[PDB]
Design a protein around this ligand. Structure first.
Ligand code: CYC
Ligand code: CYC
Ligand code: CYC
Ligand code: CYC
Ligand code: CYC
Ligand code: CYC
Ligand code: CYC
Ligand code: CYC
Ligand code: CYC
Ligand code: CYC
Ligand code: CYC
Ligand code: CYC
Lengths: 162, 172, 185, 172, 162, 162, 172, 172, 162
């Protein structure tokens, strides 16, 4: 996975050499930022229950048609509302995982990989997820450099959906 | 090839549940002990060549059958290969130390290593002895504390010994 | 550092000579040498993607935009495009990280070079190439072998040499073997 | 790389006998009923995407374990792979239908598929039930009697079902 | 084999695409031409014994040295006559197989492949078979587009031998 | 492009062979079908304006929110309505091109290539064009084999977008 | 590459207007005489070998410098290469005839062929003479009025001559 | 690939002992009879085409099922392949004869060839018979005392026969 | 290994052709020059013990400063003296093989290959053996062609080490 530690290790493995001081400096920077990163991850996960529901309602408000006009792609049925909750929960869980991993690795492996391929087959408009992630970026409740890390990952997902 | 953070995240992804408070404190402990890990890898990498060479000198004499004619380390080429493989194991172990887990050691190495040597005709038992001698060399060089603020780094030494033992048991 | 330990070659269709006109099972030859129009260049690029990565894993994130532009402006040879696919990070994550050196020799030979391992001894013979030189250097020598230059010149996409009454490598070899499935449930 | 014509010609070449009158009249029947075959394959290929998508929704509704976290059809990359595999099976079956012979299907798709699925761990039984769902959907849409010049082609529909069944049994 | 149907299948398989209307139109053309192709095939097979013997005598007349000059690569002996008849019969039999298959598949798999090697090792000059095929092309006994098809496959064999 | 004529020529070119009877039969079938194909293209282009207008209204009825929801991606503004008409006209024009070409070549080279990237970047939901092409498939005003051909190409576009 | 149908479609797409009635009529005229195009290609391709052989003998008789020692078409290896390239030109011209457009001929065969011969040191003028020999031989064989349904195919024969001329002018 | 001299030096290196007098005189005997070895290989290779052709005629005379329609070397393709494989075995055994050891023959010709023929359907027994036919041919052609300075070379022909026999036993 | 006979075989095998008269001439030359080389090999094996003893004393005298420093890479201790004798013997033992093989094959197979890494890790200076082998090179007791051919191999090894 695209974790800072593993990225340094792979860079050294490409050249078949023992870990040079450059890689060690990189991982040291990761450890120094990890305090803020882990506090941000804790904050997001302990507020996750409110965030997921709020994002669901936000997308329902921004796209009223997604709540009314019939179709499996829409949340016209309670089953569809469950699907919506499940998927926005997936996104929130992945962002917390990326926050703790220190890189985009987790969301790239479990979400972004082939995201475009399937969101067209099942006819899930990416704009829905875009708006939901924007809500989460506005109500995350983090501050300072913790906030900057979390918002960076959220926006990575936003740009990937687009 | 995973690292400590990625390992816990992968288990959490299999479970499908947000990272628990317990996992958070575990990773916080891992970050708390980061500086010692970095120091250890720096120290071992600065002396890597000398470490492996010194252990090799003793290994060949303590196991003379290998360097007697007809043995697996005999001839210049196979002697070069034995030195090369000793250094290979040391390199992947250093990778593992920085990672914090033995995943790298088992993924791109130590996955069928015994079978490869067994087909080659190398005695696996002698390879195990070589790995253990290397293990002693490495634990000694990392566990000679001087020149830095002291601490109880015995945990790091124990996990390094565990990596070397894992390799030795995988090849024999 | 060491002259790669010699391996004993086994009889294979690719090693054999045969005076056959192309069959319907002929692999099909995607040659950029003609410098075909952009639409056909798309097919050629797709075939190289289909070979280095499997049809299964070639998604949008896998697609390198730079490579798409590369093979469009009569740039570095299709061989170098193949090498770029091979050394790309997504390939290393998908294949290199999920297999041991001994299996990696087999996978890369089947896909990049397009011939199966001559024998288990050859799998061993080039495992060290992966280790000492590095995976990037291993694929470098793999596509810089004299055999490769004869097999696919420069502007020819690699293909299975001749699977005469033989299972195609893609349909017999997974991305990773069951040995790594120990990390899966 | 055989079709019906190539199959009969290969038997005749193996025996070494000039094509008998019986063989001639046995293949003229196939050509006389070719337009029906072409219509069937055209209808299945025109609805390919919808067929695979609907069947996939049904499969994940009947076996939720696949789409639950930790299942083999989770992480959105493996979901894409699963959809791709379903459409691949449909594609090779379509080849078989148009050819009129199972040679292509057994030469490329069903030549040891079990081993790959077995190694990766992908549940073969679930794949079989998915193929059967695709079978009923496709046969129904192709045999829809309104919208086409009427005729009696139950035999061809049974042959299509046979191809789907062959794949489902060979992979499971 | 290279049969038209299978050739279209393979062409679509290399790109991983379902058979679109292009392939369907190709197979439709094969079926439309099948009426004339089957007519030609029946004509050649029902008269497959007079023509084989006639072609043998034709080659003997054009090249009188092929049945009198001493050696093993000649038809002077009765066994040589049997082998010569078998060869001309093989060419005609393959043409009929190609006529029924709709494509040159049978010819390529059973005849054209490795033709030069055999004609060179067993000292069988192609000219002999060229003349034999010319005789068959002149006395096949067909009319119209069926005759065209017969004279196309036989000429393909002629231009492949030489 | 993947025109039947060019497809057979390329198949013979990669195998370094003169065009044999197989390829000639294929192109003959193409010419036999060409009469109906040209008929179909004439029919579509003669009533092109009616089809374009009707499809526009069809998507406006199926998706009411696209006519009111503010934003550039929607046709709430008259400019957006003009753009929508232009796009569905493009689709119809390419259908006529494919009818004349007897293959999917034109569609792939001018529409399908990179269709996902554009419909994702400008946030143009594929479902919109899906519904439009469904209307075209229902109101094409063709009969017989000509109707079959046009319907097939329209559905190719539909499945390509999906 | 663009065949005739594709060429008209591509021009219409570049301008951005539905194909006009005049273009439709032109294409209908083309298909009305399509059988003639097919017959011509069949007749030329079945006599390929004789065409190239007769033209080659004539070329070497008219320009003996090629087969003299020290000339270009000598040493029996270059003679083989010369025959191979002559038949290559014939092959791409036959492709062009079947297509109805010169795009394939201009994209593969004569595309950057002048430079090739200029670097190799071959006389391009002689290559043009050889192509002209092939032109007369092939046009005679294809326009042979005996053997098939009578009619006026002169327009197509002029088109075939035009392709040969295009190659001859592009090589010299 | 180890020839005779390389084989003795490799065995001596494994033992770690200077080349013994016995091995010295063995290789000296080989060198004293070297002209005979060279002449044998020269005769076999100078008649290679005729050897393979005559052996092929004999094979098809003794086993008519091969050239009967629907057989195992029927059709020009499989006929060419059978001739090719006969010549290939002859080529690698000639290599072995010049070397003086069978290492090349078992490493680059007979190294899994039995499995290849098991899969292909070619009879291993029949190919062994063919190898024996070529053995008789090569021994007879080399044992033509007319045209060469005479002497007793049957001793050197026995090992040529041994190499043919080794191939015949290894192929089935 | 890189024996003249073997090299000719390999050159012919990579081309796939039967042994031409060029290769046969080369092997004939090998046999013609294998009379003197085998004589030299016999001579050097029969006096091997005396010459290795002399070379051992030669290196002890040329490098007494290594002969006195205690350590693993030195012969100061009696065990190290035994090791030094065996390795000097190894060089002579390989030179006899080289003489019999008529090529540099044994040199590359039993030494030379990876000489750099060995002389870097154990740091056993090649100069030690080089001086010993120069003593051998003058005192070998060969004459004429035997002497010059042996000298050629010896100096190849010496210049290869450096
Ligand atoms: C962990 C990585 C991962 C992701 C992201 C994922 C997404 C995912 N979402 C899906 C569907 C869906 N997703 C939704 C969600 C929504 N409905 C709405 O109204 C909202 C706008 C929206 C929430 C924001 C709906 C309704 C479906 C069903 C689509 C259908 O049946 O047609 C499907 C198809 C199968 C199904 O119906 O569940 C997948 C695979 N699966 C994964 O394994
Ligand atoms: C994935 C990590 C990795 C490993 C483990 C590896 C090992 C490895 N060591 C090899 C050779 C070898 N390995 C040794 C090692 C030893 N010699 C001895 O005397 C001792 C008993 C032992 C050291 C303790 C020797 C002598 C050879 C050469 C064998 C030969 O040529 O005969 C070979 C044979 C093929 C070759 O030389 O390329 C492999 C695959 N290569 C790798 O890429
Ligand atoms: C058959 C080809 C071949 C060669 C050439 C070869 C060389 C060789 N020399 C070695 C060591 C050695 N070489 C010496 C030699 C010397 N000490 C001195 O003071 C002198 C100046 C000098 C004699 C010239 C010593 C003392 C060792 C042992 C070092 C150790 O084990 O650490 C070793 C290490 C293992 C061992 O002791 O055998 C090898 C492999 N091995 C081979 O298989
Ligand atoms: C570029 C890579 C890199 C390195 C090499 C590095 C080393 C490093 N080691 C340190 C301290 C230290 N290192 C140790 C470690 C040890 N305790 C022991 O008993 C052992 C002998 C040893 C383990 C090998 C301790 C206890 C401290 C001081 C307290 C602390 O920083 O945690 C410190 C902090 C104070 C200082 O500068 O000394 C740094 C920066 N930092 C880096 O970013
Ligand atoms: C080193 C990194 C890199 C760059 C920068 C690059 C540029 C680049 N842009 C290209 C195409 C193109 N670029 C444009 C660009 C534009 N059309 C417009 O109306 C705009 C004003 C403009 C966008 C801002 C177009 C339309 C093409 C397609 C031309 C064609 O292939 O037919 C091509 C032709 C081949 C290809 O598509 O790859 C190159 C080489 N290529 C590279 O490898
Ligand atoms: C052309 C013939 C052909 C077949 C049949 C084929 C199968 C095939 N499917 C694969 C992956 C896969 N196949 C599936 C399929 C499924 N997951 C599910 O939940 C379902 C039960 C099932 C779909 C119905 C999945 C999820 C993967 C990805 C596995 C992974 O990467 O972890 C792989 C792994 C290597 C790769 O990704 O390229 C192969 C080889 N490959 C081929 O080339
Ligand atoms: C490009 C390839 C191609 C197509 C697409 C094609 C269509 C086509 N289908 C036809 C007939 C037909 N199609 C059917 C088919 C069916 N009967 C049923 O009950 C089913 C629901 C369906 C089968 C699944 C039948 C019975 C006929 C009339 C008899 C015949 O010619 O086959 C006809 C002749 C009569 C007519 O004009 O309707 C054409 C031209 N022809 C072609 O050459
Ligand atoms: C179906 C594909 C196929 C072909 C074409 C084929 C041809 C073929 N013809 C052969 C022989 C032969 N063919 C002839 C034929 C002729 N004698 C004459 O006088 C005439 C001029 C001429 C007939 C036109 C003769 C005489 C031989 C024997 C050659 C010899 O043994 O020297 C042989 C040599 C093996 C035979 O008995 O052993 C082959 C392989 N075999 C095949 O499997
Ligand atoms: C010739 C092949 C071709 C296609 C297919 C194509 C699509 C295409 N559609 C576009 C925009 C657009 N497409 C629409 C279409 C619609 N609005 C709606 O409400 C409907 C639901 C729908 C019609 C069915 C609109 C409103 C825009 C402008 C969007 C914007 O600027 O943000 C744009 C951006 C440039 C522009 O604004 O025109 C492209 C490139 N371009 C091409 O060259
Ligand atoms: C395998 C593809 C295929 C071929 C090859 C084919 C041949 C073919 N050519 C035909 C006609 C014809 N062939 C010619 C040909 C000629 N008139 C001349 O004066 C010239 C010497 C020569 C052209 C260079 C003419 C004029 C016709 C009648 C009109 C036409 O259909 O084009 C006919 C119809 C009349 C008949 O012969 O029954 C057929 C079937 N049909 C096919 O489906
Ligand atoms: C360099 C060592 C070497 C050998 C020997 C070898 C054998 C070999 N012979 C082959 C073909 C073949 N081999 C035969 C063999 C025979 N049929 C018979 O009736 C005879 C008894 C026998 C001749 C002795 C046939 C019939 C084929 C053709 C297979 C086919 O086209 O279907 C093939 C198939 C693939 C190909 O043609 O490339 C191999 C691998 N390959 C090698 O690399
Ligand atoms: C270019 C490679 C090469 C070849 C081919 C070669 C052959 C060769 N064979 C020779 C003699 C000979 N050749 C034979 C061989 C035979 N005795 C028999 O009964 C058999 C019929 C036959 C075995 C083929 C004998 C007995 C001698 C005389 C003694 C000898 O020199 O070996 C001689 C010495 C006298 C002469 O010039 O003829 C040479 C040079 N030498 C070479 O360097």
């Amino acid at each position: 996975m695209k974790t800072p530690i593993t990225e340094a290790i792979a860079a050294a493995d490409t050249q078949g050499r023992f870990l040079s001081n450059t890689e060690l400096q990189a991982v040291d920077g990761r450890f120094k930022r990890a305090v803020a990163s882990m506090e941000a991850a804790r904050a997001l996960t302990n507020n996750a229950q409110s965030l997921i529901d709020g994002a669901a309602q936000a997308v329902y408000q921004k796209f009223p048609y997604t709540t009314t006009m019939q179709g499996s792609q829409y949340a016209s049925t309670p089953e569809g509302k469950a699907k919506c909750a499940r998927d926005i929960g997936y996104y929130l869980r992945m962002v917390t995982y990326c926050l703790v991993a220190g890189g985009t690795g987790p969301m790239d492996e479990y979400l972004i990989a082939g995201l475009s391929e399937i969101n067209s087959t099942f006819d899930l408009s990416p704009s829905w997820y875009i708006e939901a992630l924007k809500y989460i970026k506005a109500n995350h409740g983090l501050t300072g450099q913790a906030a900057v890390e979390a918002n960076a990952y959220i926006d990575y997902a936003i740009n990937a959906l687009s | 090839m995973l690292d400590a953070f990625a390992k816990v995240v992968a288990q959490a992804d299999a479970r499908g549940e947000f990272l628990t408070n317990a996992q958070f404190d575990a990773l916080s402990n891992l970050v708390k002990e980061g500086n010692k890990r970095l120091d250890a890898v720096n120290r071992i990498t600065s002396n890597a060549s000398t470490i492996v060479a010194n252990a090799a000198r003793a290994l060949f004499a303590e196991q003379p059958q290998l360097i007697q004619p007809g043995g697996n380390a005999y001839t210049n080429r196979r002697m070069a290969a034995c030195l090369r493989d000793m250094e290979i194991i040391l390199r992947y172990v250093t990778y593992a130390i920085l990672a914090g887990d033995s995943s790298v050691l088992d993924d791109r190495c130590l996955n069928g290593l015994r079978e490869t040597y067994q087909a080659l005709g190398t005695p696996g038992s002698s390879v195990a002895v070589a790995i253990q001698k290397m293990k002693d060399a490495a634990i000694a060089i990392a566990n000679d504390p001087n020149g830095i603020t002291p601490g109880d780094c015995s945990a790091l030494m124990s996990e390094i010994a565990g990596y070397f033992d894992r390799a030795a048991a995988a090849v024999a | 550092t060491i002259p790669l330990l010699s391996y004993a070659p086994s009889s294979q269709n690719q090693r054999v000579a045969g005076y056959e006109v192309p069959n319907e099972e002929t692999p099909w030859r995607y040659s950029l040498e003609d410098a075909v129009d952009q639409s056909d260049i798309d097919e050629l690029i797709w075939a190289a993607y289909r070979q280095v990565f499997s049809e299964h894993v070639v998604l949008k994130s896998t697609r390198q935009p730079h490579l798409e532009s590369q093979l469009a402006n009569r740039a570095i040879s299709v061989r170098d495009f193949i090498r770029g696919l091979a050394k790309s990070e997504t390939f290393r994550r998908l294949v290199v990280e999920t297999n041991s050196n001994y299996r990696l020799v087999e996978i890369a030979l089947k896909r990049l070079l397009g011939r199966a391992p001559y024998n288990k001894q050859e799998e061993l013979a080039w495992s060290i190439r992966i280790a000492t030189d590095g995976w990037q250097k291993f694929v470098d020598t793999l596509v810089d072998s004299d055999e490769y230059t004869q097999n696919f010149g420069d502007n020819t996409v690699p293909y299975q040499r001749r699977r005469y009454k033989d299972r195609p490598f893609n349909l017999v070899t997974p991305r990773y073997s069951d040995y790594w499935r120990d990390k899966l449930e």
